């Protein structure tokens, strides 16, 4: 049928508008924004904490920082660098060269389907070991918190801060899985999926949301500081939207031709 | 007393997609309401239904370069008989790639309805002419011929007043579903050919600009359904 | 019912290829309450800020390639005074208040006619930083002139040149690949939009209300919607034809809110 | 609804189980409209 | 009234500049009984042949005279594909029975505009071998 | 009620031997509803291709041993003219959709009388590829003709020579052993069947419905159902008696809808 | 609170014939519905009253090929007091063990009911003669003589104008339910002997062919009944 | 699947299909991917911390963790686009050098067992995992024959 | 009924335990008749 592109709008047609035929019947509704992101997937990969963290300081950090990178891990679909929420999402081609490897992550599924600038759920969190047999506990602190970086002296062990506090703790069986569901905490109405704002009226960066975010989380070996060895072990962080809402319908990600 | 239960054998299993709440940690936390703000996505068919660029290359032979992909189709005035433009009905084809029906449907398994294509004319107001759009079923053989789109499902578009035209895609499978990508290329996935041929040539005034353009989109129709998520493809973020 | 004069206070601008205006993503934009996170009276409309304002764009070309695209942000146009745009009594509240609430009604104008050939995309997008260079500061409108349109490339489609924190020299460089503000140029119709087609009109007709990550938002520093002018189809057109049309755009604020009432802003 | 089939029995409150907001004081809609 | 989209089977044919449907030379060629001098059951129609097929002609210049003219003979086009007029289903019908009865819609298109002088006469005339 | 004559359109085939007509397995293959799964306007039935269309089998003879059969596949018959089966306005309708739905009337003649003895499975068996040699080609008429009968063995009773593809110099060959495509040949009176016994009847009547995996299925390449005529009894008579009796067979499409019009089909 | 609760020793045990559902992981699928497709198949005795060819060695003693089974039994000119055919009633025997009764039943450990055994006379028209069909109970020898065979339960099938014979083999069970198996042979499993003798010889005008052949047919009858599936035999896939 | 054709004795099946897993190794930690029919495997890692990690450790489709010795066990729905399965054949799949009797999507899908740690913990021991399929809600359709019983 | 026992309750709603058909818009029955 004849029509104005140049209008905005245009009528979804069938195949009775110009030729002879009727209706498909439909038969499913796996498009819901309420079914379709309530799935779980792979968020992160974190090292396992045996003693207190130093929390990574701000951008740009400077020679000679001592500090434990990659033991958390923002909940955010949105791109982070260095557990700090990040606008480019960055990634390392070659091994050789000097200097630590910053730990990225994306949420690859969300921003397939993602399609719109505003977002709004509860998350539930799965925590999963990647080592067999592993006794670890998840910690985690909301948005606009932060790591108790300390510890305390029981029977000349030290016992970090972090084994405690108000916030939710949850220590794993051996072997065992840790799962629970985290409400939206920010103080923003919506997880902003892009953004053209800024955050501070000086030197901020513009793109970058400041609490973007469901907390950050860490996993820990409930140990005092005393029993460590060298063996570095991994944790894999899985995450899934509950009652997901959307507003304002925009882009999907290019897809290269090569 | 205890009561007596029989645990099953999957029990402790993490199932992703299991279809059931797990427990609260953090409760009794009101976020702020959501009153103010409009534009809420129930579906996402809804922005299926709106129709985007898709995507050719622009010219044969020489290109300064391949990534020179374009929205539109230029007319030129010489004429074979042989279509401007064809495209596989195959939602995995490059074609639709870009679109928002392409991006959306490549994340499920399978598609039902029809798909929605709208050509808009670009051209001067003082050209004149006629196209012909052509669906073609699945064959042994792409038609090619005007004659043999002429046998298919066609209709004819003509130069005025009004810019553009919405060509419904007619839903003819053997099954109820389609599979949107064509692995096996079988008569599931790949549901024949659109085609565009030009009727007349166009007309033009003298001082008239040569080759206008046809600017095509990609839309979905109000039948229109996806089923079966499926896992993404990370190939855009290398 | 292509002639359409659109009255708002003491401005009046008319059209005689009116399409309609997009109503997106409501019935009516100025339908709105009172933003429920402050409490102190807002400043609400009056109407010498119940009105048009008009700017410039740069002239498109037959040299201007496919997507190739110009950027106006909304309010940061009036901050910038971007394309000649000043705001006057609005600008001059904007200034004088912390948070700002509003929608907007656009129109922009393009001077075809028969013998021309041509497509412009005319949108209002959320959300970009389309208006900042990679390094991280806002386009100058010397820099603005000097493009004179900016030309799609592997960057702005991946979102690679988009505004970030460098790591430091303790954290190796990392390749950036891929950001979320990107453009996919076959995309942008998803967004309010119209286009101006020189075959069918001279002007297009855009209405948006209010959206954002909070029911109010800072006014210095808000991008929450964007007028992007994108080129569909290149200029063609016979010697002896009207070389280098001009671009110009309208715009109203509809149901402004004014938070935060204080001096006059200055940068640190 | 959402992905969710345990209907039946929910065991804890809902303003435990999800958030609710605070008080200040199937068929489409198009986005989009043409006057 | 001048833009109209006109629907038949699995086909839609549409013009921006329509001057009418010309009716002659009842109220509705459509409208129509089975033919009574054959007893047999006749094969109707169906969805398949419920659609328009579409042709070239030659093109037109200066140098065609006045009332210079081409032929197009129904249903004899679709028997010798003239212009690649096939036929499909409804050829594959006509070659397969002995007798036929039908009425015909037809639109010619030619693509004029501004700056060009010139008419053509459009005409279903009754009975010829001009062809 | 032996005498029965029974009318299609312009064809009407008669016997005076009728033992009834086997309705399975529906109490009426013709009662039906437009196919679901698309959405255009089905081409149905009309009074030229509601007709029947008759067809030559080869002699059945002393030398043919137990279990030896023909094969007819429908509408396979029609696309390859096998035995003369000539469709007309069917195979011309068959040949333009992408998509045929339909079942059979079918009916299968042979001339035997008094002084002979011997007997004729006739029975319609879903789903068979037995009209294809095991490289995976379909059988030409020259093939059939030289066969003159499929002679049972190893192969057909498992399956063993079932169409495959072959798994390439990259693995090691498997030794193939078994396939669900296998006749069980003292099983075949399960499908809708009658036998043509020499002693009491010279024409068998089968009544199927359409089946499929889908409510539709391709023109083209569709099996669904096939004539299969076996021998259960070998023929035996004296010298004198009539020798070499042939094998006739009329069939009925019955309640056709077509999908998917386009040209006429070209094989790649 | 925690509900008290005492799992079972059993607990985390798979059990393949559980009774019961297990967790789904991949629901709100809807698929295709069926309401075009005849021929819906209840229940597998359906299938078992369908009457299949039985099997027997064509003829002694020299064959060209010991392969050579056959669904029917050649009539001989000859006389002599032994039936032409018999069989034991024993759902195991080579006789049934291509026939829908003996695969569906084989496949279950129990069986309850009649067995119909069902002869077709494909002979000539002009071909007249009488059979004698008896059912003996089981016995420490297995009757062959004529008069034995008239003790039993036994009908006299005529030829003429019907050219068929359905034979009801009577249930005469000391259980209630018999096993299909034969393992050790016994009065369990082992229901005696269906015979064929001939009454008369077979009368012929000249110039028919000699030896006509009767057909023969298994089936269940409508009381049968099977029980308890057991496993399968793999033996057809080597 | 011999017990299935022991008693198919039809040609057309659908039903839902339970899946049970159970470990041939003692003690192993595994997990169980499942994609549907028409689906395809996502092929490649991803790096965290210099570990490669696959992509099919998530994905919008079923995971299923297993305890240390544990099992798995769910239900399928009838996935195909197809109304049923064929138990036999005879059409084909494409209209061009396609096999006749080979349906395209007569499955209920494609699982596979993976162990949950990364590319970088790998010894030489390989291990196996068996696989059990119950059907749920079964129907027939269209009477046919079962396999032949050889005399030898 | 099928091979199950359990029949008191259903966690999970049919939709999701299992498939359902979409709409478009004992004593045995025998396979076969005569005429």
């Given at each position: 049928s004849t029509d104005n592109a140049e209008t905005g709008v245009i009528e979804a047609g069938n195949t009775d508008t110009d030729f002879s035929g009727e209706l498909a019947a439909p038969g499913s509704n796996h498009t819901n924004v309420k079914f379709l992101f309530d799935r779980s997937r792979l968020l992160n990969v974190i090292k396992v904490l045996e003693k207190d963290a130093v929390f990574p300081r701000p951008f740009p950090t400077q020679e000679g920082a001592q500090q434990d990178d990659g033991y958390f891990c923002l909940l955010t679909p949105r791109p982070t660098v260095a557990s700090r929420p990040a606008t480019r999402f960055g990634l390392y081609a070659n091994p050789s060269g000097s200097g630590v490897l910053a730990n990225t992550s994306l949420d690859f599924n969300f921003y397939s389907l993602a399609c719109f600038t505003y977002f709004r759920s509860d998350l539930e969190v799965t925590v999963v070991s990647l080592e067999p047999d592993l006794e670890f506990a998840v910690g985690w602190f909301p948005s606009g918190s932060e790591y108790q970086a300390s510890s305390f002296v029981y029977d000349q062990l030290h016992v970090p801060f972090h084994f405690t506090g108000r916030t939710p703790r949850a220590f794993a069986s051996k072997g065992g899985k840790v799962s629970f569901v985290l409400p939206?905490?920010?103080?923003?109405?919506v997880l902003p999926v892009r953004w053209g704002g800024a955050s501070k009226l000086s030197s901020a960066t513009r793109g970058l949301p400041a609490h973007a975010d469901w907390g950050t989380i860490y996993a820990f070996v409930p140990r005092p500081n005393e029993k460590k060895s060298t063996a570095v072990k991994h944790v894999a962080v899985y995450i899934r939207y509950k009652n997901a809402r959307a507003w304002c319908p925009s882009m999907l990600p290019f897809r290269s031709y090569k | 007393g205890p009561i007596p239960t029989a645990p099953r054998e999957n029990s402790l299993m993490f199932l992703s997609t299991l279809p059931d709440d797990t427990v609260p940690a953090y409760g009794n936390v009101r976020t702020p309401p959501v009153n103010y703000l409009p534009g809420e996505i129930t579906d996402l068919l809804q922005l299926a239904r709106i129709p985007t660029l898709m995507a050719f290359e622009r010219v044969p032979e020489p290109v300064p370069a391949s990534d020179t992909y374009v929205p539109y189709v230029a007319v030129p005035t010489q004429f074979d008989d042989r279509p401007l433009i064809s495209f596989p009905i195959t939602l995995s084809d490059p074609v639709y790639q870009n679109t928002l029906v392409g991006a959306i449907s490549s994340n499920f398994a399978n598609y039902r309805g029809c798909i929605q294509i709208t050509l808009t004319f670009c051209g001067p107001m003082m050209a004149r002419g006629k196209f012909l759009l052509s669906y073609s079923p699945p064959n042994g053989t792409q038609p090619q011929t005007l004659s043999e789109a002429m046998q298919c499902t066609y209709s004819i578009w003509d130069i005025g007043l009004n810019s553009s035209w919405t060509f419904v895609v007619p839903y003819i499978s053997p099954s109820d579903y389609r599979e949107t990508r064509a692995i096996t290329n079988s008569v599931y996935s790949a549901d024949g050919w659109f085609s565009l041929h030009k009727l007349t040539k166009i007309t033009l005034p003298p001082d008239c600009p040569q080759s206008p353009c046809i600017l095509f989109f990609a839309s979905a129709g109000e039948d229109y359904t996806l089923r079966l998520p499926v896992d993404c493809n990370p190939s855009y973020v290398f | 019912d292509r002639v359409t004069t659109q009255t708002a206070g003491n401005t009046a601008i008319n059209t005689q290829s009116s399409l309609g205006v997009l109503c997106?993503?409501?019935?009516?934009?100025?339908?709105s309450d009172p933003p429920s996170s402050s409490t102190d009276q807002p400043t609400t409309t009056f109407t010498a800020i119940d009105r048009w304002y008009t700017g410039r764009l740069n002239s498109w070309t037959?040299?201007?390639?496919?997507?190739s695209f110009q950027a106006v942000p909304l309010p940061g146009a009036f901050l910038s005074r971007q394309g000649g745009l000043n705001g006057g009594a609005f600008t001059a509240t904007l200034h004088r208040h912390f948070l700002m609430k509003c929608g907007w009604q656009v129109q922009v104008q393009c001077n075809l006619t028969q013998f021309h050939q041509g497509a412009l995309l005319v949108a209002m997008v959320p959300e970009t930083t389309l208006d900042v260079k990679p390094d991280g500061k806002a386009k100058s409108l010397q820099e603005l002139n000097e493009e004179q349109w900016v030309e799609m490339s592997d960057d702005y489609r991946t979102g690679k040149n988009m505004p970030f924190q460098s790591l430091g020299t303790y954290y190796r460089p990392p390749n950036w690949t891929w950001g979320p503000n990107f453009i996919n140029p076959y995309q942008v119709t998803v967004f309010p939009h119209q286009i101006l087609n020189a075959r069918t009109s001279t002007s297009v007709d855009v209405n948006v209300p209010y959206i954002g990550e909070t029911p109010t938002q800072s006014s210095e520093t808000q991008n929450s919607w964007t007028l992007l002018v994108m080129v569909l189809v290149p200029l063609d057109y016979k010697e002896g034809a009207t070389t280098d049309p001009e671009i110009t755009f309208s715009v109203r604020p509809t149901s402004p809110y004014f938070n935060g009432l204080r001096n006059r802003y200055t940068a640190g | 609804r959402g992905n969710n089939g345990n209907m039946t029995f929910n065991y804890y409150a809902n303003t435990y189980q999800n958030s609710v907001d605070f008080s200040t004081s199937g068929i489409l809609n198009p986005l989009g409209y043409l006057k």
């Open positions: 939206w905490n920010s103080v923003s109405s | - | 997106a993503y409501v019935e009516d934009p100025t339908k037959k040299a201007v390639k496919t997507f | -």
